[PDB]
Amino acid sequence: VAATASEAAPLQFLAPYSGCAMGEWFRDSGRHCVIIYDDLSKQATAYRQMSLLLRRPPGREAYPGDVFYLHSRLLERAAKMGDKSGGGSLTALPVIETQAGDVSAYIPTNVISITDGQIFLETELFYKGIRPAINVGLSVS
Amino acid sequence: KISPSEMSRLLEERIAGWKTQTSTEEVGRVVSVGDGIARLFGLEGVQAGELVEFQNGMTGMALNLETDNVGVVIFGDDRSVLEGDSVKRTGRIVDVPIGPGLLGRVVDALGNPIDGKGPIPAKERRRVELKAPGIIPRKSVHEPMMTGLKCVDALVPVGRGQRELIIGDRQTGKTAVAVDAIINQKEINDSTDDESKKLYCIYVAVGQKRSTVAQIVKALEQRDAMKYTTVVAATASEAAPLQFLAPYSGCAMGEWFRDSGRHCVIIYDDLSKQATAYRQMSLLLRRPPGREAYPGDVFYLHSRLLERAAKMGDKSGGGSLTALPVIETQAGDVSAYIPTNVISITDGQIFLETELFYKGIRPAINVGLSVSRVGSAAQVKAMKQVAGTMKLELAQYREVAAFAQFGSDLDASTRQLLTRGTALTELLKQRQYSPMKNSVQVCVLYCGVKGYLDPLDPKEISRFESLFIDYINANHQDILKTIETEKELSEKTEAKLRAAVDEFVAMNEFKK
Amino acid sequence: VAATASEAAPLQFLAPYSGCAMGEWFRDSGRHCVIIYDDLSKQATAYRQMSLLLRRPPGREAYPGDVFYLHSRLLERAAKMGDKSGGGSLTALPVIETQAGDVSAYIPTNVISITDGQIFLETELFYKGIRPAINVGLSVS
Amino acid sequence: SVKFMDQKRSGEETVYFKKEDEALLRNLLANHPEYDPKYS
Amino acid sequence: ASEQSARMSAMDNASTNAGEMISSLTLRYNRARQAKITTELVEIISGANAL
Amino acid sequence: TNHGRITQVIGAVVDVHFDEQLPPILNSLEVQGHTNRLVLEVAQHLGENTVRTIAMDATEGLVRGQKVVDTGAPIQVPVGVETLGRIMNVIGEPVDECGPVPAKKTYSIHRAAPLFADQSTEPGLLQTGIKVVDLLAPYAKGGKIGLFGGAGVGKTVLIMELINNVANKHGGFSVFAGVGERTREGNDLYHEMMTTGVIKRKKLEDGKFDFTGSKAALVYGQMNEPPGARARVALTALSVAEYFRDEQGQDVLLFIDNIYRFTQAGSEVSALLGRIPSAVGYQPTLATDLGQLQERITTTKKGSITSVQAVYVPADDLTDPAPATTFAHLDATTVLSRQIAELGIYPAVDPLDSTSRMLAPEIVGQEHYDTARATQKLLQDYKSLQDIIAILGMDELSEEDKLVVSRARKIQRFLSQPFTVAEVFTGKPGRFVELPETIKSAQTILRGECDDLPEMAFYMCGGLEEVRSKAVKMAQEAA
Amino acid sequence: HRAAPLFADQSTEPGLLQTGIKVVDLLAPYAKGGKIGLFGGAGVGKTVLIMELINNVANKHGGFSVFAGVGERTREGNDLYHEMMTTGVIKRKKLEDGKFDFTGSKAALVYGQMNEPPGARARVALTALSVAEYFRDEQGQDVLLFIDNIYRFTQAGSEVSALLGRIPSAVGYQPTLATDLGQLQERITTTKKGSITSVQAVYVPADDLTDPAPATTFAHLDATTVLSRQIAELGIYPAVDPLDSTSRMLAPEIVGQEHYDTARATQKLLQDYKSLQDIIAILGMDELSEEDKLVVSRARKIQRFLSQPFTVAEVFTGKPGRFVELPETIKSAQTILRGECDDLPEMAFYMCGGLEEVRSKAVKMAQ
Amino acid sequence: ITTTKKGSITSVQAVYVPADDLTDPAPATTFAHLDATTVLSRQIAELGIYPAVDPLDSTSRMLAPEIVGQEHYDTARATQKLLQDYKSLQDIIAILGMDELSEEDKLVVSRARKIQRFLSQPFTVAEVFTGKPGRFVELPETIKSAQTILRGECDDLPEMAFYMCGGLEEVRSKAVKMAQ
Numbered sequence A, C: 001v002a003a004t005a006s007e008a009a010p011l012q013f014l015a016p017y018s019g020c021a022m023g024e025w026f027r028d029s030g031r032h033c034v035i036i037y038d039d040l041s042k043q044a045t046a047y048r049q050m051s052l053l054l055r056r057p058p059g060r061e062a063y064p065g066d067v068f069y070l071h072s073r074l075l076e077r078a079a080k081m082g083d084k085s086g087g088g089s090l091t092a093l094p095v096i097e098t099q100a101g102d103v104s105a106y107i108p109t110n111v112i113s114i115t116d117g118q119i120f121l122e123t124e125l126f127y128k129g130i131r132p133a134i135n136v137g138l139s140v141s
Numbered sequence B: 001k002i003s004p005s006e007m008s009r010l011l012e013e014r015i016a017g018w019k020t021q022t023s024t025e026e027v028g029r030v031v032s033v034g035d036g037i038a039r040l041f042g043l044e045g046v047q048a049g050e051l052v053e054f055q056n057g058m059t060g061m062a063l064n065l066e067t068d069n070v071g072v073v074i075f076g077d078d079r080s081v082l083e084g085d086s087v088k089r090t091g092r093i094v095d096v097p098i099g100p101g102l103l104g105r106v107v108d109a110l111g112n113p114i115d116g117k118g119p120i121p122a123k124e125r126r127r128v129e130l131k132a133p134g135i136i137p138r139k140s141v142h143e144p145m146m147t148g149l150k151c152v153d154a155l156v157p158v159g160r161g162q163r164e165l166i167i168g169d170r171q172t173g174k175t176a177v178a179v180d181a182i183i184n185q186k187e188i189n190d191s192t193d194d195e196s197k198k199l200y201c202i203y204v205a206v207g208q209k210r211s212t213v214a215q216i217v218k219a220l221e222q223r224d225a226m227k228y229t230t231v232v233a234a235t236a237s238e239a240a241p242l243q244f245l246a247p248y249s250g251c252a253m254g255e256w257f258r259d260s261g262r263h264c265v266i267i268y269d270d271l272s273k274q275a276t277a278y279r280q281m282s283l284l285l286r287r288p289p290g291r292e293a294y295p296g297d298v299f300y301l302h303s304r305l306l307e308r309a310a311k312m313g314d315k316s317g318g319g320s321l322t323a324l325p326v327i328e329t330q331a332g333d334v335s336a337y338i339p340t341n342v343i344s345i346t347d348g349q350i351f352l353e354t355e356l357f358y359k360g361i362r363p364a365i366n367v368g369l370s371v372s373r374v375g376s377a378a379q380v381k382a383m384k385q386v387a388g389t390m391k392l393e394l395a396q397y398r399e400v401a402a403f404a405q406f407g408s409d410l411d412a413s414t415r416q417l418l419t420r421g422t423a424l425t426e427l428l429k430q431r432q433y434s435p436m437k438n439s440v441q442v443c444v445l446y447c448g449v450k451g452y453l454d455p456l457d458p459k460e461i462s463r464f465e466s467l468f469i470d471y472i473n474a475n476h477q478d479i480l481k482t483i484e485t486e487k488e489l490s491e492k493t494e495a496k497l498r499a500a501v502d503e504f505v506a507m508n509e510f511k512k
Numbered sequence D: 001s002v003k004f005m006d007q008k009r010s011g012e013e014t015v016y017f018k019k020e021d022e023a024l025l026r027n028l029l030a031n032h033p034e035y036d037p038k039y040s
Numbered sequence E: 001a002s003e004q005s006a007r008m009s010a011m012d013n014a015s016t017n018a019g020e021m022i023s024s025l026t027l028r029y030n031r032a033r034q035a036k037i038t039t040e041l042v043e044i045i046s047g048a049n050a051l
Numbered sequence F: 001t002n003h004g005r006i007t008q009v010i011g012a013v014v015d016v017h018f019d020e021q022l023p024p025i026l027n028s029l030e031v032q033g034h035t036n037r038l039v040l041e042v043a044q045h046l047g048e049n050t051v052r053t054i055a056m057d058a059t060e061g062l063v064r065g066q067k068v069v070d071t072g073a074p075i076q077v078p079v080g081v082e083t084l085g086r087i088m089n090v091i092g093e094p095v096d097e098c099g100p101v102p103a104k105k106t107y108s109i110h111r112a113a114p115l116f117a118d119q120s121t122e123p124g125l126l127q128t129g130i131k132v133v134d135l136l137a138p139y140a141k142g143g144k145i146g147l148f149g150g151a152g153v154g155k156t157v158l159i160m161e162l163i164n165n166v167a168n169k170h171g172g173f174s175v176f177a178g179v180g181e182r183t184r185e186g187n188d189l190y191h192e193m194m195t196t197g198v199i200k201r202k203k204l205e206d207g208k209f210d211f212t213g214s215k216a217a218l219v220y221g222q223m224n225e226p227p228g229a230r231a232r233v234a235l236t237a238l239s240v241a242e243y244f245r246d247e248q249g250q251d252v253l254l255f256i257d258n259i260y261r262f263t264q265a266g267s268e269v270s271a272l273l274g275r276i277p278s279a280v281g282y283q284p285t286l287a288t289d290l291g292q293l294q295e296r297i298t299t300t301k302k303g304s305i306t307s308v309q310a311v312y313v314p315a316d317d318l319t320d321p322a323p324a325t326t327f328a329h330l331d332a333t334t335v336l337s338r339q340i341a342e343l344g345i346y347p348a349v350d351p352l353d354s355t356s357r358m359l360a361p362e363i364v365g366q367e368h369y370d371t372a373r374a375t376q377k378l379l380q381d382y383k384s385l386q387d388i389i390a391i392l393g394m395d396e397l398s399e400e401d402k403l404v405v406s407r408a409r410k411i412q413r414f415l416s417q418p419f420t421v422a423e424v425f426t427g428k429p430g431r432f433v434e435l436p437e438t439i440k441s442a443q444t445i446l447r448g449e450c451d452d453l454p455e456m457a458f459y460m461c462g463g464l465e466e467v468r469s470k471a472v473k474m475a476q477e478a479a
Numbered sequence G: 001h002r003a004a005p006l007f008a009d010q011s012t013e014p015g016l017l018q019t020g021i022k023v024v025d026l027l028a029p030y031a032k033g034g035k036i037g038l039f040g041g042a043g044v045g046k047t048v049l050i051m052e053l054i055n056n057v058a059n060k061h062g063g064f065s066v067f068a069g070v071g072e073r074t075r076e077g078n079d080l081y082h083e084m085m086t087t088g089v090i091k092r093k094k095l096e097d098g099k100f101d102f103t104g105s106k107a108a109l110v111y112g113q114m115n116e117p118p119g120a121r122a123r124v125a126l127t128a129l130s131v132a133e134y135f136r137d138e139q140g141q142d143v144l145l146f147i148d149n150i151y152r153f154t155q156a157g158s159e160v161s162a163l164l165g166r167i168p169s170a171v172g173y174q175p176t177l178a179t180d181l182g183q184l185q186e187r188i189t190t191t192k193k194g195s196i197t198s199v200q201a202v203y204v205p206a207d208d209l210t211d212p213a214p215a216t217t218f219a220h221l222d223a224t225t226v227l228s229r230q231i232a233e234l235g236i237y238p239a240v241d242p243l244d245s246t247s248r249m250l251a252p253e254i255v256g257q258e259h260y261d262t263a264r265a266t267q268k269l270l271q272d273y274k275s276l277q278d279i280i281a282i283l284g285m286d287e288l289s290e291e292d293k294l295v296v297s298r299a300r301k302i303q304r305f306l307s308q309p310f311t312v313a314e315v316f317t318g319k320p321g322r323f324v325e326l327p328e329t330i331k332s333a334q335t336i337l338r339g340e341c342d343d344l345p346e347m348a349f350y351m352c353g354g355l356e357e358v359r360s361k362a363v364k365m366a367q
Numbered sequence H: 001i002t003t004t005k006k007g008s009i010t011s012v013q014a015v016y017v018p019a020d021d022l023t024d025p026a027p028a029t030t031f032a033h034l035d036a037t038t039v040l041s042r043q044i045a046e047l048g049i050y051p052a053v054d055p056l057d058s059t060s061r062m063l064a065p066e067i068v069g070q071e072h073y074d075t076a077r078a079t080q081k082l083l084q085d086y087k088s089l090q091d092i093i094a095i096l097g098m099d100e101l102s103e104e105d106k107l108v109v110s111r112a113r114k115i116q117r118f119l120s121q122p123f124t125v126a127e128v129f130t131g132k133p134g135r136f137v138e139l140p141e142t143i144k145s146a147q148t149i150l151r152g153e154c155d156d157l158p159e160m161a162f163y164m165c166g167g168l169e170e171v172r173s174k175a176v177k178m179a180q
Ligand SMILES: Nc1ncnc2c1ncn2[C@@H]1O[C@H](COP(=O)(O)OP(=O)(O)OP(=O)(O)O)[C@@H](O)[C@H]1O
Pocket: B169, B170, B171, B172, B173, B174, B175, B176, B177, B328, B362, B363, B430, B431, B432, B433, F327, F328, F356, F357, F358, F359, F360
C-alpha cells in the first residue's frame, strides 16, 4: 500500500487504515496476518498538514491533540481472536524514525506507551559492526 | 461574528421601534457560559472587581468589562447558569470580615466558615484588593520573629515585617517548618497578657486537599495553637477565583493586626497555585498570555500581595505583618518565571533540599543558598555571639567538605574544620513539632561552637543536646530567664554556662 | 548615514538601503566606492520588530523568513561593473556582532551564505593586547 | 561521560564484590558450621 | 616519587579540562534554554491566534 | 424531553441548536437516527439557544440537522450489587456480552465532593506483602496511593500483585478503572479475576448468568474509546464507588490505570472547545478538573475509599504538569525507575523518591522509623560515592566506605522479591513478606550481623532464612 | 518623553569624571555623559559607594544628582531615605508652622514602587531622566543619575506589551526592547551645556549575559563595576573587584600612556598574586622564591592601599573622609610597583588615603 | 526526479542546514528522498580537513556487497568501525588525555587520525586560494591505501604526511621530505 510523497495528504493519512482494513479480512476469517507500517511519522505529518489547512488549532510541536486517538484506533485493530471468532490474528510492527536518538518526543512517546514492546536501533552499534544494530537492553517484549 | 445586541430577539424590538431600554444598569442577561466564565449583556455601570448575583443564589466577580458585554468569573459550577439568566449587581466590592472572631477559625476566601462551628462575628469588613502602605508609614526591622529552628534563628533570621520565602522541593518539611513556627508562639502568647508582645498567625492554603488541611487543624487543636491563629482554605474543589483570592483575604485579615498595633505572621501555602489559578482565569477570559502562558500581571499580583508585609512606625501604632510565602520548585531550578518573580519580590530565602532530607539532615536547609537580606538586625545579641562564629565555621566546612572522603591522609587545621562542621551539622538537626526557645538555642550553640562536641561521636550529639536541655531546664532557669530578659550573653552568664556544661559532662558519659 | 538607537525602526531598516542607493551612483557612473554597514544585526532586530508588530508569524529566534531576502536585496548590489557598464565598482564591508563567539547562529550563517569572505575578531586577543585582533584561521577570502 | 562513568563503576563494583563473595563463600562454613549440612 | 608528581600534574590538567568543558556546556545550556522558551512561546501564540 | 438539531460537527465536538428550553451544562443528550447509541455531554453555552457538546462514541456517520433528545440529567450510570462481577462502559452499558444490568438505581457521574466538615479517619496501615513498600512507603487504608513511572517498569504488574495480596483478603468491595490502557491487559485482568474468584460468573441453562459473590466491579475507557469517554470513565467508576461508600457504608478499594490519560483526553478537546493552550500542551483547566475528582476520592464518616493510581511519566520527567499537580493529591507515593529496573532489582522502587504521609514515629513506632531512615541514609551515602568510584576506584575508599557500599548493595539486592504474577517472566514462585520480618532482616543487615554473607544471596528472597540457604548452596557448589 | 540631543548639540571631546575614589579613577575610569554598570547586591557597601559618589561630585563638580527606584522594595526605599537624612545627602529641617525646609541637598529621588502597576516602573527612568535634563540643559551642570535596576524597566516593558497584545520576542521580551532602551539611553550623554552621568545597576538573569536585556545594555555601557563579598570579608571597602571591572576609557589616548601602563601593571600583579594564592593554598608559603614573596607583598599592599574611608561613613565609624586625586594614586601605584615602599608594613596601607598618611601611620605604629 | 524506461536523471542537490541543526523539518524530510548522502561538518572544517565530510552521517544505498565488491564493503565497514571507536574516546581524551588509554586504544586513535587526514583531497578549483594542484584519485588506489592503513603498513609514517596527498606514494614522498 504505497502512499508516497507526491500522493496527497489524505492518501498518506488513509493508507495505514486501508492496510488494517485489508488485514481484518484475515483476522476475522480464521487466518493470520502481519502488517508493517513504514514511516508512521508521515501519517502524523499529514494529519498536522490537514488540520492546519482546515484551520484547526494545533497543540505541541504543531500537532493536534487527536494524535493519540489517531494511533489508538489504528493499533487496537491488531488482535488475537478467540476460537469462536475463527482463531485469527493480526500482528503489528510499526516503524519510527527518531532524531538524535530523542525518544523523549511526543510521537515516539505515544507509540512506545501504546505498544507491547520495543526494538531500538542505534548508529553507534550499526557502525561498530553489529548488524542488525539491536540494543537488547532497551529493547523489550 | 455577531454582538449580543445584534441577536434576532433584540433586533425584532429595535426594528419594531420598541424603546424598552428602561432595564436599569443593575440587571443583565447571561449570553454565554463555560469553564467557570459567564458573559452578560448590560450592567453598564458595574465596577471592575464588583460582585454580581445570579438567579439561583450563586455569585461571581465581574472582571473583563467590554464595550458590548461583561465578563464574569463564577464562584462555583456552571450547571446553574444558562440562557439569558438574569444577573443583578450587589454594589459592594469583594470584602471579608476582620477581627478577633476569626482566631481559631477556618474560613474560605470570602469569610464563609467551613468548620461547622457557627457564624463569624465581624464589626469590620475590609476590602480584598487595597493599596499597600507607603514608605513613610513603614519602619526598619529591629525585632525578631521566630524561635524553634536553630538553623533559621542563627543563620537565616526572620524579623517582624520581613518576607522570607520558604522555597524547596516536594516532601522536604515545608509545612512542618510552618507548623513549628506556629506552634512555638504558644509559650509567648500564654506568657503575656498584652496583645502587643504576642504574635498571631494566619495560614492561607491554596491547592491543598482537605484531608491534609484537616490534619493541620488536628495537630493545632492537639497543641492548643488555634487560639492565636486562623486558617483560610482555598482547596482544589474550590474554584480558581477562590484560590486566586485567598491570599488577599489573608492579607486583609492581617491588616487588622498590622494597623492596630499588633503583630501577625501570614503563611501563603502554594502561591504557585495562586498564579496557576490566575493563568487559568486569563486563558478563559481570553486575555493575552506571556511565557509559560502566564499573563503580565503576575509580578504585579504577587507584588500587591507581598508589599503589605510591613513594619509600621510608632505613629501608626508599631504593628507589623511578617510573611513566609512557600514555593515548590519542580527541579531545583529557581530560574523559572514564578521563582524569579518571587525572589525578586521577597526579603530573603530559605532553600530546602532533598539530598539532605535523606542524610538525616532535617530540616534540610541548604545554608549556602539560604540568605536573609535583613540579617543580624533581626537577632538578639545572645544569638549574634554564636551565629557570627558558626557561619564562618560552616563556611569553612563547605570549603573543605569534599575532603571528608580523603581526611585519613590530610593534616590538622583541616581535620578540625571537618570535625567541627560535622558536629554543628548534627547539632542543628531537630525533630518534627518540637521547637525550642532562644535561650536554649544560645546555650546549645555555645556548647557547640566552644568545642565541647569535637571529641564526641556525632551519633551521640542528639543525646548530648537532649540531656543538656533537660538538665538546664531542671537546674538553671535563672540563666534562661536572664538570657530571655536581657537578650544578651554577658561574661557572667558565660561563666555560669561553662560551669553548667562542665558539670553536665562530668555527670554524664559519652562514647568518644 | 545615521540611524541611531533613538531613531525609529523603519529608519534603521532603511538606512542601509539609502547608503547602497548612494553608492549605486558611483557604481553606475564608473566611480568606485565602499559602504560600511556598522550594524546589520540591528537592522534585522528592527525588521523582526516591525513583523511582530504587524502580527506576522515568527520563526527561528523569532526572526521571520524574509530576513535572508532582506539582507540579500542589500548585499547583492555590491558589484564590479563590466567594460560596457562603465567599469565602476562598489565593495561592501558589513559588520556583525555575535554573542559569545557563536557563529552557528542564524544571522551569522545567513550572512556567511551571502558574503565572499570573513574577517573574525576575538575578545581573547583583544583582552590580551593583540590589536587589531584579527584571527587568521577563521578569517578567509 | 554519563553511561561511561556508570558502566565503569558498575563493572568495577561487580568484580570487586564478586571476589569478596568468593572469599566469603570459601570461609563461611568453617566459622559457621551450624549451617553446614555436613553435620546434619 | 615520580609517579606521584605525574599524578599531581594529571590532576591539574584534568581540572583545567573540566573547567573548559563546564564553560562550553554552560553556553550550550543557556542556548538550549532560550530555544526551548522561544519554541514554547511561539507554540502558545500560534495556538492562541489559531482560534 | 426537549428536542434539538445538530448544526455542525468537528471531530469529537458537536454544536447543537434548540428552539426552546436549553439544557444545563453537563447534561446528557441522545442522538436520534444513528446506527448505534450515541451520547453527547454538554460542556458550554454559546448563545442563541446553541450549545456545544462532547461525544462519547465516534461521530462518523453524523449529519447536520440530525435530531437530538435531552435526557434532563447527566450521564447516569447504574449502581448496586448488580454491577458486581460485570464489565461496564462509560455510559453504564455492559460490554462483557452477558446481558443487561438489572440495577435498581442510578447515579450521576457528576457530583460534589464531601465538604471539609466530613473528616477523614485514622491512618490505617495496609499490609501488601511487599518489602520496600511495607517498610519505606507504608500504604494507607483510606487514602490515596501513587505509582509513578514511565513505560516498562512494572506498574500494572505491581497493581496485579497488590490486587492478589489485598483485594482477595478484603471484606469490603473493590473497583478497577482502565483509563486508556491496553485491551490485552483488560482481558488478562478479567481472566485472572475469574480464575482467582474475584469474579464468579455462573452461566445458566436458560441463557442467563449469575454473578453472585464477585466482590469487584470493572470499568473501561480504553485506548480505542475516544476522549470524553476516556475522560468520564473515571467519574463513572468513582460514582460506582461513591455508591458503596455512602449508602452501604462499605470499605472499598479503587485501582486506576493510567489516570494521565484523563488529562490527555482533556487536552485533546480543549482547543476544539475554544480554550487557549496553557504550558507545554495540556489545558488550563487541569488542576480544577483533577481536584473535583480527587476531592470526591476521600474517606468520610460513612465509609472509606483506599485508592491506588498509576501515573504514567512521559520521558521519565517528573516536572511535567500532570504529575506535578498529582503529587500534592496523594497520601502515599512510590516512584519506579529504569536505572534500577535495568539491574534486575524488581520491584524497581526508588526509596529516595518514594514517600508517605504515614512514615512518622507516632504512627509506625521508632523501631520502624529509625530503621527506615537509617536505610535511606545508607543508600544516600552509597549514592554520594558513585562518582568517586567511577573516577578513582574502590582502591581509594576506606574500609568504612567499603562496608557502607557492601551493606547498601546488599540492601538494594535484598529489597527485590519475586511476585506471583511474574512467574510468566521469571518462572520463580511468589512470596509474601510480612512487615516485622522485613524490619528484623533490615535491622540485622544494618547492624552488621550478615557482613560475612555474600551478595548474590540477597536476590529474589523474602527473608534471611532463604539467604542463609542460598549462601550454603553457593558454598557447596563452590566446593 | 523628550527627544534626545541632536547630532549638532553633542560634545565630541570625551572626558573623565573625577569621582574621588582610587580604584575607580585608576582601573575603571568613569566618563562624563557616560553609563556605568554596577554589578552588586548588599553586604558590599553599595549604598555607601552611592552616597560617596554623590557627595564628592557635588562638592567638586558642583553638580546635582538623581536616584531612580524602578520597582524597588519599600523598606529599602525607607532605609535609603533615612540613610541620606543621616549622612547629610538630604537636609530636611523642620519649620515653626509645621512645614519642612529641604535646604541644600545633593540628590532628588524618584520612586516607582513595587505595588505600582506596569507603566510606572516603565516611565520612572524617563521621569528621573527629564529631572536630570533640566539641570543639564538650563542650569548647565554635570549631574548624576543612579538607577536601582535596569532589568525591571525591561520587565515592565514586556508586561505592557503583553497587555497591549504585542507578540512577544525570543524569550518573552517585547519587540520594542532595543528601541525603548535607546529612547531612554540616548538622552544620557554630554552636550555643549552640561552632562548627565549615570550608574545603572544590572541583574543578569540565570547568569546569562546573552539574554537580550543585558546584551542590549552592555552596548550602551561605557564601564563596569563589580562588587564581591569576598573582599568585603577582608574588611576592604569599597569592595571593588579590580580585575572584573572594565572600561572603554582605559585606552592610552584619553588617559595618556602612563595611566594605561600603571593599570595593566597592577592587573598583572593581581593576577600573579591570585595564581600564587592558588598555589600557596596547596604547597604552603614556604616554597616561594624571593621574587614570588615580593610579588605577594606588593599585591597585598596595593589591594589594601586601594581601600579608603568615606566622608559619609564618618558618622558610622568616626574616621573622616579622604579625597584622593588620580595623579596621586598613579604616583603611589608606581612606587608600590617599583618596590620602593616594600619596607613599609602591611596594615599601614589599609584604611589609608595616600603615601603621606601611610608613612605617618607606619611611623606611629612603630611605637 | 527519477530514472525511468525512457532516460535517466542523475541529481546533485545542495541542502542548507540552518544554525547547523540537522533536526530541522526541512532536512529531516529531505533525508527520506535521497539515494546518496554527504553531510559536511564545521567541527571537521575547523581542523582544515577538506572536503569536510562526516563519514558517519554520510551514507548511501550503493554500498552493499552485491553492488560494490566484498573488499570494498569490508574496507568501508572497517573504516566506519575505526572512526566510531575513535569517536567513543573523545570525552575521556578531552578530560584525562591519551596517556590514560591502553595500547589498542592508542593504536586506534593513531590510525583514526591518519585516515582522517588521508580522507582529504586538494581540488582543482581550490588552486586559487590553496595554490596546490588538484588530485584525482581512483577507487582501487583508495581501497589499497585504506587496506594498508587499517592493516598497519603505514603506522611508521607521521600524521601530517597524509594531509592533502591523494594516494600513498605522495604520502611516503612527503614523509621522506619531512624527515629532513
Ligand atoms: N524534622 C523532621 N523530623 C522528622 N520528620 C520530618 C521532619 N521534617 C519533615 N519530616 C517529614 O517530611 C514529610 C513532608 O513534610 P511536609 O509536608 O512539611 O513537606 P512538604 O515539602 O511541604 O510536603 P508537600 O510538598 O507534599 O506539601 C513528612 O512525611 C515529615 O514526616
